[PDB]
């Protein structure tokens, strides 16, 4: 719905990286995997966390 | 009625059916099937006798034995002596829109029949149309790269559309019945005339007469099976 | 190979009759008082093993049928190598899987049947 | 192994040639039936022997080539799960598909799908699947395996219900 | 600059397929069929039985969607609210009636399919969808009836109007039959079955053929049917059946047919033999004769014409069917595949609801002629249609 | 049996081509030549 | 097959043919009805020989 706070599998906080992940892509033009490695998310478990989140809240907040 | 039959190719999914008693009888339309809504036959009829159709009251089989019987929704309305003329025009006319695209026409060349259908409930799909020529040597698909880009410019502006594709004679809709009078290429490269030991074997184009090509084989599936990854690497059940 | 006759005046079918005195075959009608003599003495035939219909469909336009396979066989007539080919169109369980080829310049029909007993088709 | 798959691929190639000569042979009318069995039946019985004898040789091929440490093999070895046919289909070739005891039949007129020409009795036209699951199937193949598949899924509900009533 | 003429490649298929789905989306089958209902089938349902015994209905409008209230009354209804109040996302029907002498106007509620042209949400934009509390992703093609969302499942049936031949198994005395289910887009949907039977198994004694017409309680030799239509001489009869004079095979097949019908040599007679098989002893000949004429003009192959001059067309089609049967008997063609999907039709929303709303507009128009057979002298039950739909 | 063609020729012993063509069907179907009723194919196997 | 005679391919042929049901029909290529009025000679070239044996 919203970034999850930690990697399901390792504990790494990952909830504090979504803003940035998305600024890394749209503002500084990185491909999704150099981006993720910039955030330090270098095991595949945390990668998948960022890489597959879907921000559904964004669509929830359009309702009044 | 429960079995998958060759003729459901591309119109219903070969995989999605519930288990048990419904097995087989409950189906789901392929991602790209549609179903006709019916359209009235009377211009077709009228066109036909503009083009030389002879009416049943004049027919004398003994004096025109070579003739092609012409049926429209299941009525014999008469006979014609050049169906190939007739048929090249009919198709032209449906590939520019003047006969509606969801109409079906078949000629059966050895049966000496030409059957057209304009009723609802027929299920259909689109295919590419493949034409000789060109000029450029072989049989080629009528869409080409420029058509695609007009497609994708439109996509990115979010005007060329689906329908532009039907109007221009590049794609046409085919129902099971007319599928029997065609020959379709599975990938556009079967038209052009050392392998990767890991790739699958495919057995070539032993074909110079395609009239069409599939848009994508992965459209034979339905909604659900379109979510399985690599279902071409799985046992069918 | 019977060939079938009708009344000149009515168009109804004719039936055989023996001319009892002169020992000959007549066709008469059952409606008119028409009669005529018979063309042959064959009045009926029953083929248990039949070929009529092996070559059903060979039509002027056979070659524009895109379904048909094509081969580079040559004809006995044209020395042409543009054929279309099919199997027997009878539709028997008891058919052979021989090929009938259709020369697309001269329209001659020819088989791959090595034991060819057939003149015509 | 790359060598094994080249031997599988030939194994398969050889069977398709044997069917091709049987073909031509029938197509010249030099094939004989034997006694009450039709010509065509005779032909089918022969190409399906050929194609399955392929399938099999191709699989024994795979099975041999794989090592003791092959975990699928270790399961079959022990008994715990998997058989030959499994190795075979996964790794070497899935095989002839069939619906009521026969090759895929001509549901369209004189053909199994409109991507073929008419009168085609070859392997590929009526349902042999050359590929393995690793390699994946083609579209045509795909559809004839599902025809096949389907036949089981019905045959297994009818089985299960016929079976429960007898039992009671 | 890349050639515009260039041939495409496998990647380029997805563009075409995206284009297909931007235009059509995923449930057009649903939408296109409702929309044609709304726009065309409706109205056509009113101008078949428009007049009675005078009164004739004209044009239809269909409202946007709305509700009959509890108190404070009649109101635009959005799909969000119909769901939550257990309402029925419906609009109403209005004809144009005519009194004319010989011895607007509400008529009901039609459940409307979501995203059809008549539902608010087809025109809406994204924003508009959110305001309305409709998820932008919802796709439509279902109705709301009493608050529950309800989908029609396509139904598969055989097509009509198609000739099928069939061999028949071993202890049967017929060996093949050929069969058509004749029927209409305009008239009604009145479904006559013609069957054409070949009597006796493979070498019985005179194998004949005979045809089962409706209300006729014996099977009729086919040559008698051709004379009742007007084709009298063996010669012309066989010609509409065997279109090749050197098929001695087929014609030899037609001989016992000709002996079967040799007793009847002109069309009056033919009428009459059929007429008698349809009437009781007593009925007079000219009434017999016209029975037979009416069966044949109106209930024998009706997909061909149901009106007066149309005999050479039915004779030929009967002939063709017999040609079909014989070709199967003679083992030149296979029995028909009853599993050819091309021969099936699948019925959706449109036509399912036209089975229905024609069936009930024909109660509703017969309730009008009882405002009228019992008037010794704008008074219409509306609901019948509203609640036959929703029910 | 030498004869190169096998031919059977039949006559009856006044309205005479009906009896012929029923006669013909008895011929062809209800005459057992060799064999035992009901046994349609037989195959050897080793 | 009978105890001596069970691995003669040719004695099991015979046995198959004594059993397998056989009608005129399985052996008959065509039938025909001709008007051939004079039972001592014939309209049929080919059966001159046949006739000529009586
Ligand atoms: Zn992690
Ligand atoms: Zn006469
Ligand atoms: Zn030639």
Partner C contacted by B65 (CB < 8 A): no
The topology under which CATH files domain D1-138 is Topoisomerase I; Chain A, domain 4 (1.10.132)
**Gap from F15 CA to chain C (nearest CA, Å):** 9
User: To 5 degrees, how large is the angle CA E229–CA E230–CA E232?
Assistant: 125
- Residue C12 to residue E234, Cβ atoms within 8 A: yes
- Residue E203 to residue F22, Cβ atoms within 8 A: no
Contacts of C44 in chain G (CB under 8 A): 32-33
> What residues pack around ion ligand 3 (CB closer than 5 A)?
C 75, 77-78, 103, 106, 108
Minimum Cα–Cα distance from F20: chain C residue: C44
Alpha-carbon distance of E348 to B121, in angstroms, equals 8
Q: Do E172 and E130 share a structural domain? A: no
B228: CA distance to ligand 1 center in Å? 26
| DSSP conformational letter for D32 | P
- Residue C56 to residue E236, Cβ atoms within 8 A: no
Alpha-carbon distance of B107 to B110, in angstroms, equals 9
Cβ–Cβ < 8 Å for C12, E234: yes
- Residue C95 to residue D28, Cβ atoms within 8 A: no
Report the residue count for chain D.
168
Alpha-carbon distance of A45 to D51, in angstroms, equals 46
- Residue C62 to residue B208, Cβ atoms within 8 A: no
Instruction: Give the CA-trace dihedral at E337, E339, E340, E343, to 10 degrees.
Output: 100
Q: Do B215 and B160 share a structural domain? A: yes
Cβ–Cβ < 8 Å for C93, D38: yes
| Top CATH class, C1-46 | mainly beta
Sign of torsion, CA D52 D53 D56 D57? negative
* Reduced DSSP (H G I as helix, E B as strand, rest coil) percent helix, strand, coil of chain E, to 5: 35, 15, 45
Cβ–Cβ < 8 Å for E89, E149: no
Q: To which residue do tokens 């069995």 refer?
A: D37
Q: Would you say C106 is a known binding-site residue?
A: yes
- G residues 5-44 lying closer than 8 A (beta carbon) to F: 9, 12-13, 16-25, 27-28, 31, 33, 39
Binding-site members of A for Zn(2+) are: 7, 10, 45-46
Residue in C68, C73, C96 to test binding to D, most D beta-carbons within 10 Å = C96
Sign of torsion, CA B43 B44 B47 B48? negative
Smallest Cβ distance to C16: which of F17, F24, F28? F17
Partner G contacted by F22 (CB < 8 A): no
Cβ–Cβ < 8 Å for E198, E209: yes
E192 by Cβ neighbours in 10 Å (0-12 / 13-18 / 19+) ranks as middle
- The alpha carbon of residue D63 and the mean position of all alpha carbons in its chain are separated, in whole angstroms, by 18
Alpha-carbon distance of E89 to E144, in angstroms, equals 5
| E64 SS3 class | strand
Orientation angle between helical segments E234-241 and E311-329, nearest 10 degrees:
70
Contacts of E247 in chain C (CB under 8 A): 52
- Ligand that comes closest to the CA of residue C36: 2
Up-side HSE of residue E112: CA atoms within 13 Å toward CB?
28
- The answer, yes or no, to whether C and A have at least 3 beta-carbon pairs within 8 Å is no
Alpha-carbon distance of E344 to C108, in angstroms, equals 39
- The alpha carbon of residue E139 and the mean position of all alpha carbons in its chain are separated, in whole angstroms, by 30
Cβ–Cβ < 8 Å for D137, D131: yes
C101: CA distance to ligand 3 center in Å? 10
| φ/ψ of residue E174, rounded to 5 | -90, 145
Partner F contacted by D35 (CB < 8 A): yes
Q: Do B132 and B97 share a structural domain? A: no
Alpha-carbon distance of E231 to D45, in angstroms, equals 52
User: Which residue range(s) make up the domain with E61?
Assistant: 28-140+349-391
- Residue E205 to residue F29, Cβ atoms within 8 A: no
Minimum Cα–Cα distance from E204: chain F residue: F25
- Residue G35 to residue C44, Cβ atoms within 8 A: no
- Residue D149 to residue B233, Cβ atoms within 8 A: no
- Could you count the other beta carbons within 10 Å of the beta carbon of residue E188? 12
Q: Would you say C7 is a known binding-site residue?
A: yes
Q: To which residue do tokens 């996509």 refer?
A: B155
Contacts of D115 in chain B (CB under 8 A): 183-186, 214
Q: To which residue do tokens 């015979």 refer?
A: G14
* Reduced DSSP (H G I as helix, E B as strand, rest coil) percent helix, strand, coil of chain C, to 5: 0, 30, 65
Partner G contacted by F17 (CB < 8 A): yes
Domain ranges of chain C: 1-46, 47-121
Instruction: Report CA Rg, chain E.
Output: 28
Q: Do E275 and E250 share a structural domain? A: yes
User: To 5 degrees, how large is the angle CA F3–CA F6–CA F7?
Assistant: 115
Minimum Cα–Cα distance from E256: chain F residue: F18
Minimum Cα–Cα distance from E28: chain B residue: B34
Q: Do B201 and B134 share a structural domain? A: yes
Alpha-carbon distance of A27 to B3, in angstroms, equals 55
Alpha-carbon distance of G24 to F8, in angstroms, equals 11
Smallest Cβ distance to B143: which of E2, E8, E243? E8
Pick from E253, E191, E196: nearest CA to E220: E196
Written as six digits, the tokens of E38 are 């709304």
Domain ranges of chain A: 1-64
Alpha-carbon distance of C79 to C69, in angstroms, equals 19
- Chains touching F (at least 3 CB pairs under 8 A) are C, D, E, G
Written as six digits, the tokens of B76 are 């014999």
- β-pairing, B212-213 with B184-185? parallel
Sign of torsion, CA E121 E125 E131 E135? positive
- The alpha carbon of residue E223 and the mean position of all alpha carbons in its chain are separated, in whole angstroms, by 29
Q: If you write DSSP's letter for every residue of E231-258 in order, what string do you get?
A: --SHHHHHHHH---TT-HHHHHHHHHHH
Pick from E203, D38, C43, D32: nearest CA to G24: E203
- Residue D138 to residue B200, Cβ atoms within 8 A: yes
| φ/ψ of residue A47, rounded to 5 | -55, -45
The topology under which CATH files domain C47-121 is N-terminal domain of TfIIb (2.20.25)
User: To 5 degrees, how large is the angle CA B16–CA B20–CA B23?
Assistant: 40
- Residue F24 to residue C46, Cβ atoms within 8 A: yes
Alpha-carbon distance of E191 to E162, in angstroms, equals 12
- Ligand that comes closest to the CA of residue A45: 1
Pick from B34, B18, B30: nearest CA to B218: B30
Pick from E221, E207, E211: nearest CA to E255: E207
Alpha-carbon distance of E206 to E208, in angstroms, equals 6
Up-side HSE of residue E83: CA atoms within 13 Å toward CB?
11
Q: Would you say C76 is a known binding-site residue?
A: no
What count of CB pairs under 8 Å joins C to D? 47
Cβ–Cβ < 8 Å for G22, F32: yes
Q: Looking at the DSSP assignment, which residues form a beta bridge with residue E195?
A: E179, E212
- Residue C87 to residue D38, Cβ atoms within 8 A: no
Smallest Cβ distance to F21: which of C16, C44, C48? C44
What count of CB pairs under 8 Å joins D to E? 3
Q: Do E387 and E320 share a structural domain? A: no
Q: If you write DSSP's letter for every residue of C96-120 in order, what string do you get?
A: ---EEEEETTT--EEE--TT---S-
Sign of torsion, CA E254 E255 E260 E262? positive
> What residues pack around ion ligand 1 (CB closer than 5 A)?
A 7, 9-10, 45-46
Partner C contacted by E339 (CB < 8 A): no
- The alpha carbon of residue D151 and the mean position of all alpha carbons in its chain are separated, in whole angstroms, by 15
User: To 5 degrees, how large is the angle CA C33–CA C35–CA C37?
Assistant: 170
Give residues with Cβ within 8 angstroms of F40, minimum separation 6: D36, G20, G21
- Could you count the other beta carbons within 10 Å of the beta carbon of residue B175? 24
Written as six digits, the tokens of C73 are 């066989």
Contacts of C49 in chain F (CB under 8 A): none
Alpha-carbon distance of C84 to C64, in angstroms, equals 10
| E16 SS3 class | helix
Q: Would you say C69 is a known binding-site residue?
A: no
C90: CA distance to ligand 3 center in Å? 23
- C residues 40-59 lying closer than 8 A (beta carbon) to B: 56-59
Contacts of B155 in chain E (CB under 8 A): 15, 18-19, 22
Cβ–Cβ < 8 Å for D108, B9: no
Pick from E216, E174, E188, E168: nearest CA to E359: E188
C6: CA distance to ligand 2 center in Å? 8
- Chains touching C (at least 3 CB pairs under 8 A) are B, D, E, F, G
Q: To which residue do tokens 């009669």 refer?
A: C35
In CATH, A1-64 is 1.10.10.60 = yes
Taking each continuous run of H as one helix and of E as one strand, the counts in chain G are 3, 2
Minimum Cα–Cα distance from C48: chain F residue: F28
Experimental method used, please? X-ray
What count of CB pairs under 8 Å joins C to F? 7
User: Which residue range(s) make up the domain with B76?
Assistant: 38-119
- Chains touching A (at least 3 CB pairs under 8 A) are E
């Amino acid at each position: 719905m919203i970034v999850p706070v930690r990697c399901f599998s390792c504990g790494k906080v990952v909830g504090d990286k979504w803003e940035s992940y998305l600024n890394l892509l749209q503002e500084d033009e990185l491909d999704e995997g150099t981006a993720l490695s910039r955030l330090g998310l270098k095991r595949y478990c945390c990668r998948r966390m960022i890489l597959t989140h879907v921000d559904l809240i964004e669509k929830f907040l359009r309702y009044n | 009625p429960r079995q998958l039959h060759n003729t459901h190719w591309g119109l219903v999914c070969p995989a999605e059916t519930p288990e048990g008693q419904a097995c087989g009888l409950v189906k789901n339309l392929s991602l790209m099937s549609c179903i006709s809504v019916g359209t009235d036959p009377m211009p077709i009829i009228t066109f036909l006798s503009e083009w030389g159709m002879e009416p049943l009251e004049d027919y004398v089989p003994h004096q025109s034995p070579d003739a092609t019987r012409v049926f429209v929704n299941g009525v014999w309305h008469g006979v014609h002596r050049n169906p190939a003329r007739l048929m090249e025009t009919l198709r032209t006319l449906r590939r520019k829109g003047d006969i509606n695209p969801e109409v079906s026409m078949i000629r059966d060349i050895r049966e000496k029949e030409l059957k057209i259908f304009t009723d609802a409930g027929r299920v259909y799909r689109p295919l590419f149309i493949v034409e000789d020529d060109e000029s450029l040597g072989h049989k080629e698909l009528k869409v080409r790269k420029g058509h695609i880009a007009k497609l994708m410019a439109t996509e990115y502006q979010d005007e060329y559309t689906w329908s532009s594709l039907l109007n221009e004679g590049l794609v046409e809709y085919i129902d099971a019945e007319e599928e029997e009078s065609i020959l379709i290429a599975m990938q556009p490269e079967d038209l052009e005339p050392d392998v990767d030991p890991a790739k699958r074997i495919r057995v070539s184009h032993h074909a110079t007469t395609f009239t069409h090509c599939e848009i994508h084989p992965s459209m034979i599936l339905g909604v659900a099976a379109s979510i399985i990854p690599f279902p071409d690497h799985n046992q069918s059940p | 190979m019977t060939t079938f006759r009708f009344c000149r005046d009515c168009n109804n079918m004719l039936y055989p009759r023996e001319d009892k005195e002169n020992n000959r075959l007549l066709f008469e009608c059952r409606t008119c008082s028409y009669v005529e003599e018979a063309g042959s003495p064959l009045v009926y035939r029953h083929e248990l093993i039949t070929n009529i219909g092996e070559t059903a469909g060979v039509v002027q336009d056979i070659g524009s049928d895109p379904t048909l396979p094509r081969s580079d066989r040559e004809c006995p007539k044209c020395h042409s190598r543009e054929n279309v080919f099919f199997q027997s169109q009878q539709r028997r369980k008891d058919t052979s899987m021989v090929l009938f080829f259709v020369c697309l310049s001269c329209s001659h029909i020819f088989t791959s049947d090595q034991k060819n007993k057939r003149t015509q088709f | 192994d790359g060598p094994t798959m080249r031997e599988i691929t030939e194994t398969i190639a050889e069977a398709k040639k044997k069917v091709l000569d049987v073909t031509k042979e029938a197509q010249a009318n030099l094939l004989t039936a034997k006694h009450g069995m039709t010509l065509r039946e005779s032909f089918e019985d022969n190409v399906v022997r050929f194609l399955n004898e392929a399938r099999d040789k191709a699989g024994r091929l795979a099975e041999v080539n794989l090592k003791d440490l092959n975990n699928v093999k270790q399961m079959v070895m022990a008994g715990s799960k998997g058989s030959f046919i499994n190795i075979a289909q996964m790794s070497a070739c899935v095989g002839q598909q069939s619906v009521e005891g026969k090759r895929i039949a001509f549901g369209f007129v004189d053909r199994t799908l409109p991507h073929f020409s008419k009168d085609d009795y070859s392997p590929e036209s009526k349902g042999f699947v050359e590929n393995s699951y690793l390699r994946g199937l083609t579209p045509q193949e795909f559809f004839f395996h599902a025809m096949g598949g389907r036949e089981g899924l019905i045959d297994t509900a009818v089985k299960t219900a016929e079976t429960g009533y007898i039992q009671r | 600059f890349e050639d515009e003429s260039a041939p495409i490649t496998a990647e380029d298929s997805w563009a075409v397929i995206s284009a297909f789905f931007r235009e059509k989306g995923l449930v057009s089958q649903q939408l296109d069929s409702f929309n044609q209902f709304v726009d065309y089938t409706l109205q056509d349902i009113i101008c078949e039985d428009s007049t009675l015994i005078e009164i004739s209905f004209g044009k239809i409008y269909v409202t946007k969607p709305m509700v009959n209230e509890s108190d404070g009354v009649t109101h635009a209804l959005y799909p969000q609210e119909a769901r939550l109040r257990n309402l029925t996302y419906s609009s109403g029907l209005f004809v144009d009636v005519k009194k004319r002498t010989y011895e607007k106007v509400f008529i009901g509620r039609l459940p409307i399919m979501l995203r059809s042209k008549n539902c608010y949400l087809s025109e809406a934009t994204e924003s508009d969808l959110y305001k309305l509390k409709e998820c932008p992703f919802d796709m439509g093609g279902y109705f709301i009836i009493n608050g529950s969302e309800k989908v029609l499942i396509a139904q598969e049936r055989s097509a009509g109007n198609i000739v099928q031949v069939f061999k028949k198994a071993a202890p049967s005395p017929i060996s093949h039959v050929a069969e058509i289910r004749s029927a209409l887009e305009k008239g009604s949907r009145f479904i006559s079955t013609l069957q054409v039977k070949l009597y006796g198994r493979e070498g019985s004694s005179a194998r004949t053929i005979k045809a089962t017409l409706p209300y006729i309680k014996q099977d009729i030799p086919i040559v008698i049917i051709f004379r009742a239509l007007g084709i009298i001489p063996d010669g012309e009869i066989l010609e509409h059946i065997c279109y090749d004079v050197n098929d001695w095979q087929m014609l030899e097949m037609l001989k016992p047919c000709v002996e079967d019908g040799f007793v009847i040599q002109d069309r009056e007679t033919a009428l009459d033999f059929i007429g008698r098989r349809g009437t009781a002893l007593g009925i007079k000949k000219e009434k017999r004769i016209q029975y037979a004429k009416d069966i044949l003009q109106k209930e024998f192959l009706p997909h061909i014409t149901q009106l007066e001059g149309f005999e050479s067309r039915k004779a030929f089609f009967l002939g063709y069917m017999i040609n079909r049967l014989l070709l199967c008997a003679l083992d030149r063609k296979d029995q028909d595949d009853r599993d050819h999907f091309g021969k099936k039709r699948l019925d959706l929303a449109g036509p399912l609801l036209a089975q229905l709303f024609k069936t009930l507009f024909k109660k509703l128009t017969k309730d009008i002629f009882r405002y009228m057979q019992r008037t010794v002298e704008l008074a219409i039950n509306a609901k019948t249609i509203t609640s036959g739909l929703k029910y | 049996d030498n004869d190169e063609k096998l031919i059977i020729r039949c006559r009856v012993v006044a309205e005479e081509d009906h009896m012929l063509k029923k006669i013909e069907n008895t011929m062809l179907e209800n005459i057992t030549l060799r064999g035992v009723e009901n046994i349609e194919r037989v195959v050897m196997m080793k | 097959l009978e105890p001596g005679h069970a691995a003669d391919q040719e004695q099991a042929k015979l046995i198959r043919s004594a059993i397998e049901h056989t009608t005129l029909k399985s052996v008959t290529i065509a039938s025909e009805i001709y008007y051939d009025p004079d039972p001592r000679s014939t309209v049929i070239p080919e059966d001159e020989e046949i006739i000529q044996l009586h």
